[PDB]
Design a protein around this nucleic acid. Structure first.
Lengths: 114, 306, 191, 114
RNA sequence: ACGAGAACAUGCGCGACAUUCCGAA
């Protein structure tokens, strides 16, 4: 699915209405910082501290959407905002790692199509 | 590269905007004394709790939502005069032209809390003087000035008559010398060139706009009161609200009449409410103190010494 | 081979900004205090010394060269200048934050419209503990190189450091606690 | 945490006549000033001076409420002043951090929706 | 009374040299 959304919003190169890795570096730095927290803990379920921090990730997602319009279009089309909801709903490490793999595949295809 | 010491003579009050405006609840103001006492946040609240009037102040805020003056609250509670001065930061003289005051603009202050004038204010004012790579032109922030010199001044609009404005701004009083350090490169800019350019900039500003101010009867009253100092060399207008025509490239790069009609055209586009409805070019565009001698806002003089 | 360790304090005279509010100043993540990166210092002194990769041979040996076929190690190792503990306690004595905010109207003359902007600067009076290491490969060139180090520091004390200094940003003053040889037999008092 | 539903209901595109980017900023700059102060303290519980700065924080809240009725309607809906009362009672750093992360949440969601 | 039996894929080796988050207001 990650390859599809990048394909659909790839325009001639303008991606996600002008999204670059510099626009996403604030969000992804938080995402991989959260990734190392989940990676280290050997728990089948997300930690309570991680859950509150992921809620702050949701807040930062909206903050970056308001700041950079390109990031806003990137989030809505991807549903990465909605994916941060379901991982908190399931509250499992395995679902979250699938979400991080989804975001990593997202920026990977985003760079591939640029 | 040579280092010049810069001295600013404050012939007129200078107010650089810091983006902070405080209403009457954040500082005491005595109408009879015409004095404003700046009050910080935590000191007022902690003292209010100690005297037990914190509940009373909240009740006073609820009774009058539109305006709840801090001074009237102090008067009705009859707290000690020294108690009022305990939480005060400093004392500033008020020069009102109106009686109370609605808003108070704050002169820019550094972290330490003392008054200083940024080097970007000089950089912006000097650039407009020359206009009509600037990497060589290097300035530095001034040394702090004494807090006593800071005082509240009132904007005055002169359209064939003197008219006070409800706005107030924090400005440095007259008779002040502040110091800068400026580094120049002998190739791009020269000390003789900049001082000559400032003198020409003030002269063209004078004969294109200020003389038009003098001709109107309102300007004559301003002159007779000493508003234009007899000293006015190098003249600049650092403070905000000193006037739109001051430090403009339109006057230098265009003839007197062509620049004036362009100033009128741009003013009517920005201000459609008043300037836009005006269908004719005026003869002078734009049409717009405790001490006896009046002063013009922003008036200042530089002097560069190697 | 000798190592001479220059420990001192760089006291900041104006609003210093190194922005890595339009640009927040760089901060050490561990303490969240402002920091002067050692690369900001080293780049500024190297550029000013060159003015006063292809540079003068004196500069190349002083700050390092990467020329193909001839690589010279940097005799100067400017380290990050961290926020001084003494200055931080001095700031804490007041109700003062370590970083102020500076505003600029940014008026465009053609349209007479000003675009506001904010710059986060370390407040005037802050001090930073700078660490400088000089590596001694040629003994006879130490005195000459240290003379050029004085030239670089003197240029810095007249110029700015980081941010837009043409409008009064980043002006600094250099004081030196001690210049002593930390490794080897080199005489510290000569320098 | 619950800021999204709060700003969604209060939104009237702008939040209100008085909740512009500049009128609100004055409040969040005091929030910022205290936020750095607690950040630098590095203590488990808020200090007396931290509480003193918090004391002025709700005082400024009513200050802006009186000046602008739009700020008053926003403050009473968020119950943000109530959280200011709530944080003092617990007197702990992590609690202040949650309140200020919530503080960043309102402004972030306000920017996102506009 | 096993094409057996003995036998370290082992020793030396900086992910390193130059690099202002800077110009403009």
């Amino acid at each position: 699915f990650a390859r599809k959304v990048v394909e659909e919003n790839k325009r001639v190169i303008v991606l996600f209405n002008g999204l670059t890795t510099s626009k996403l570096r604030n969000l992804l730095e938080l995402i991989n910082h959260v990734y190392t927290k989940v990676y280290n803990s050997d728990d089948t379920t997300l930690s309570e501290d991680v859950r509150d921090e992921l809620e702050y990730l949701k807040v930062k997602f909206a903050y970056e959407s308001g700041r950079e319009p390109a990031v806003r279009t990137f989030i809505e089309k991807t549903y990465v905002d909605k994916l941060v909801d379901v991982v908190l709903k399931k509250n499992t490490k395995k679902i979250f790692l699938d979400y991080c793999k989804y975001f990593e595949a997202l920026v990977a295809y985003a760079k591939f199509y640029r | 590269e040579k280092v010049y010491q810069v001295k600013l003579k404050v012939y007129g009050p200078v107010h650089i905007g810091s983006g902070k405006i405080i209403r009457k609840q954040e500082y005491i103001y005595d109408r009879r004394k015409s004095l404003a006492h700046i009050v910080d946040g935590p000191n007022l609240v902690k003292f209010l709790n100690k005297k037990g009037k914190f509940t009373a102040y909240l009740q006073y805020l609820n009774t009058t939502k539109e305006r709840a003056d801090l001074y009237t609250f102090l008067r009705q509670e009859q707290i000690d005069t020294n108690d009022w001065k305990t939480f005060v930061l400093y004392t500033e003289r008020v020069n009102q032209g109106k009686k109370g005051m609605n808003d108070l603009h704050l002169f820019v202050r550094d972290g330490r809390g003392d008054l200083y004038i940024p080097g970007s204010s000089l950089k912006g004012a000097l650039r407009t003087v020359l206009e009509g790579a600037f990497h060589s032109l290097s300035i530095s922030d001034s040394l702090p000035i004494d807090p006593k010199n800071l005082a509240i001044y009132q904007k005055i609009d002169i359209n064939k008559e003197l008219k006070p404005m409800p706005l107030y701004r924090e400005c440095v009083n007259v008779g002040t010398t502040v110091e800068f350090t400026m580094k120049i490169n002998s190739d791009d800019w020269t000390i003789e060139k900049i001082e000559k350019q400032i003198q020409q900039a003030y002269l063209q500003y004078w004969n294109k706009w200020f003389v038009g101010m003098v001709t109107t009867p309102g300007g004559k009253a301003f002159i007779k009161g000493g508003g234009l100092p007899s000293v006015l060399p190098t003249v600049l207008f650092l403070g905000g609200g000193t006037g739109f025509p001051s430090k403009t490239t339109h006057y230098l790069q265009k003839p007197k009449e062509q620049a004036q009609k362009d100033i009128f055209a741009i003013l009517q586009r920005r201000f459609r409410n008043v300037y836009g409805k005006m269908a004719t070019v005026p003869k002078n565009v734009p049409m717009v103190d405790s001490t006896n001698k009046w002063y013009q806002q922003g008036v200042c003089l530089l002097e560069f010494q190697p | 081979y000798s190592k001479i360790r220059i420990v001192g304090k760089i006291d900041v005279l104006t609003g210093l900004h190194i922005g890595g509010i339009a640009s927040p100043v760089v901060r050490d993540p561990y303490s969240r205090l402002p920091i002067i990166p050692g690369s900001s210092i080293k780049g500024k002194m190297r550029s000013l010394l060159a003015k006063h990769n292809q540079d003068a041979p004196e500069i190349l040996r002083l700050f390092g060269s990467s020329q193909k076929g001839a690589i010279q190690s940097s005799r100067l190792q400017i380290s990050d200048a961290f926020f001084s503990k003494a200055s931080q306690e001095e700031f804490d004595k007041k109700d003062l934050a370590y970083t102020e905010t500076k505003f600029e109207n940014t008026i465009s003359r053609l349209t007479a419209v000003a675009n506001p902007r904010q710059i986060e600067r370390v407040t005037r009076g802050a001090s930073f503990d700078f660490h400088i290491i000089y590596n001694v490969e040629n003994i006879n060139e130490v005195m000459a190189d240290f003379e050029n180090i004085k030239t670089a520091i003197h240029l810095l004390e007249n110029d700015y450091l980081g941010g837009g200094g043409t409008r009064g940003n980043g002006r600094i003053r250099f004081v030196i606690d001690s210049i002593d040889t930390v490794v080897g037999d080199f005489d510290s008092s000569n320098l």
